[PDB]
Ligand binder design. Structure first.
Ligand SMILES: *[C@@H]1O[C@H](CO)[C@@H](O[C@@H]2O[C@H](CO)[C@@H](O[C@@H]3O[C@H](CO)[C@@H](O[C@@H]4O[C@H](CO)[C@@H](O[C@@H]5O[C@H](CO)[C@@H](O[C@@H]6O[C@H](CO)[C@@H](O)[C@H](O)[C@@H]6O)[C@H](O)[C@@H]5O)[C@H](O)[C@@H]4O)[C@H](O)[C@@H]3O)[C@H](O)[C@H]2NC(C)=O)[C@H](O)[C@H]1NC(C)=O
Ligand SMILES: *[C@@H]1O[C@H](CO)[C@@H](O[C@@H]2O[C@H](CO)[C@@H](O[C@H]3O[C@H](CO[C@@H]4O[C@H](CO)[C@@H](O)[C@H](O)[C@@H]4O)[C@@H](OC4O[C@H](CO)[C@@H](O)[C@H](O)[C@@H]4O)[C@H](O)[C@@H]3O)[C@H](O)[C@H]2NC(C)=O)[C@H](O)[C@H]1NC(C)=O
Ligand SMILES: *[C@@H]1O[C@H](CO)[C@@H](O[C@@H]2O[C@H](CO)[C@@H](O)[C@H](O)[C@H]2NC(C)=O)[C@H](O)[C@H]1NC(C)=O
Ligand SMILES: OC[C@H]1O[C@H](O[C@H]2[C@H](O)[C@@H](O)[C@H](O)O[C@@H]2CO)[C@H](O)[C@@H](O)[C@@H]1O
Ligand SMILES: [Fe+3]
Ligand SMILES: [Zn+2]
Ligand SMILES: [Zn+2]
Ligand SMILES: [Zn+2]
Length: 341
């Protein structure tokens, strides 16, 4: 058989990947790159096999010929009798989150406010909110909309990176990897929690997972759900319990992608690796947990119960959904079928 070469984005993911590799008996090994796009390029070159991607990155990867293999499946209600690996995914809720204390901030007064984004090109953090904003403002100048932002992956000298903080030393400001303090779901929510931004573009789960003691992290320790609100598209504000009626979109779950020629083997290896290291995994938590990273969502989201089989052997467009694909396409006209590499 062959080994599977995972691609880790940044040095923290690399550390986790190297643990996984050690525990896997080298069935999985690790390549690393600085950005998700660079990992995609490694995969395209055949120098890595696979990584797990947000839907916006799935679009990039898809255009370049990479295919979805398995999807993250979090806890559900529905389809409650089937195994996680066979339970249909549900998709996560992209939300706009503000402080309750920031009274009178709504969707319609976001202009010239400070924003926190997971990263450029990600679903909840970018594609959905900026796609909506471009459409409603009828302008492609999404780079001049918020007074300041943290939008990892944007030009570090620009207003879209002005709120980003980098790493301990204050290097890597605005890089789109976990070295950036305000990267990703948990980083963007932290940017809001610390009042660096006025609004965070994250998902519903992020808010719950980092409040009311669900996170023991210093910046999250003491956060309370009731101190946050969601911005609905109709201009109202709701408690974070109302995400099902106050979201920006429903997003397709992050999913593993590979070259088509390696998909079957990546799939088999992953199904076995999560049997060992997944949620009820034979050797998790004693040895290693693939879906834990102390809240940092490294390699996979920490709320992943399993990687689930896809159904209909879907193309990247089918997996993302035609509506989301066209929304992305429309947005990218601002910055039209390619491989961008
Ligand atoms: C925004 O993001 C949040 C973070 O992801 C989401 O919150 C999380 O939601 C999930 C569930 O969607 C929660 O997971 C659960 O946590 C529970 C406690 O830790 C677990 O314990 C029990 O789980 C059972 C299964 O869900 C529940 O029992 C029931 O299920 C039975 C059988 O299906 C049903 O049967 C009925 O029961 C009735 C009782 O009176 C009876 O009258 C009827 O005749 C009928 O028999 C019924 O549905 C029942 O409720 C049980 O209640 C426990 O919950 C559970 O296994 C699961 O792991 C996370 O805890 C949430 N996380 C946090 C931090 O809150 C949030 O949902 C999301 N928002 C939106 C809108 O998507
Ligand atoms: C920012 O603005 C842009 C521009 O408005 C916007 O892009 C537009 O997005 C629209 C929504 O995706 C899109 O409109 C479409 O819907 C048509 C049908 O959608 C269907 O739903 C019904 C009901 O569930 C079902 O019958 C279908 O199964 C579809 O799921 C779609 O197609 C048609 O084909 C059908 C046959 O296959 C026919 O029955 C029917 O006659 C239609 O011809 C359209 O192709 C289209 O997807 C707009 O096209 C699109 N505009 C442009 C110019 O591209 C972005 O969405 C927005 N950004 C954000 C983030 O919101
Ligand atoms: C690494 O991958 C190999 C190949 O899939 C696994 O090998 C299994 O080994 C046991 C014991 O020799 C056999 O009974 C199985 O038949 C092998 N797998 C298959 C399906 O051929 C091995 O278990 C993996 N190790 C880890 C730690 O992941
Ligand atoms: O792959 C299943 C995905 O289903 C949805 O996608 C729909 C989409 O809503 C619609 O525009 C189109 O007509 O059909 C696709 C199915 O490919 C969601 O995008 C996701 O929840 C699912 O991954
Ligand atoms: Fe995402
Ligand atoms: Zn092999
Ligand atoms: Zn909806
Ligand atoms: Zn198909």
């Amino acid at each position: 058989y062959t080994r599977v070469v995972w691609c880790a984005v940044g040095p923290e993911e690399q550390k986790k990947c190297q643990q996984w590799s050690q525990q896997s008996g080298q069935n999985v090994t690790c390549a690393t790159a600085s950005t998700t796009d660079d990992c995609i390029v490694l995969v395209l070159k055949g120098e890595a096999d696979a990584l797990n991607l947000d839907g916006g990155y799935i679009y990039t990867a898809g255009k370049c010929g990479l295919v979805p293999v398995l999807a993250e499946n979090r806890k559900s209600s529905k389809h409650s009798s089937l195994d996680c690996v066979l339970r249909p995914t549900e998709g996560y809720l992209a939300v706009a989150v503000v402080k309750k204390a920031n009274e009178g901030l709504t969707w319609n007064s976001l202009k010239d406010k400070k924003s926190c984004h997971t990263a450029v090109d990600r679903t909840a953090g970018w594609n959905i909110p900026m796609g909506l904003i471009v459409n409603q403002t009828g302008s492609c100048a999404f780079d001049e909309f918020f007074s300041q932002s943290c939008a990892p992956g944007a030009d570090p000298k620009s207003r879209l990176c002005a709120l980003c903080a980098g790493d301990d030393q204050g290097l890597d400001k605005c890089v789109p990897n976990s070295k950036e303090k305000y990267y990703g779901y948990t980083g963007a929510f932290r940017c809001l929690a610390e009042d660096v931004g006025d609004v965070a573009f994250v998902k519903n789960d992020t808010v719950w997972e980092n409040t009311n003691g669900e996170s023991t992290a210093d910046w999250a320790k003491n956060l309370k759900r009731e101190d946050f609100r969601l911005l609905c598209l109709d201009g109202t504000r709701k408690p974070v319990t109302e995400a099902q009626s106050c979201h920006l979109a429903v997003a397709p779950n992050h999913a593993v992608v590979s070259r088509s020629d390696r998909a079957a083997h990546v799939e088999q290896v992953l199904l076995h690796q999560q049997a060992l290291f997944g949620k009820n995994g034979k050797n998790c938590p004693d040895k290693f947990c693939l879906f834990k990273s102390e809240t940092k969502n490294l390699l996979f989201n920490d709320n992943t119960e399993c990687l689930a089989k896809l159904g209909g052997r879907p193309t990247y467009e089918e997996y993302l959904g035609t509506e989301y694909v066209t929304a992305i396409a429309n947005l990218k006209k601002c910055s039209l079928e390619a491989c961008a590499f």
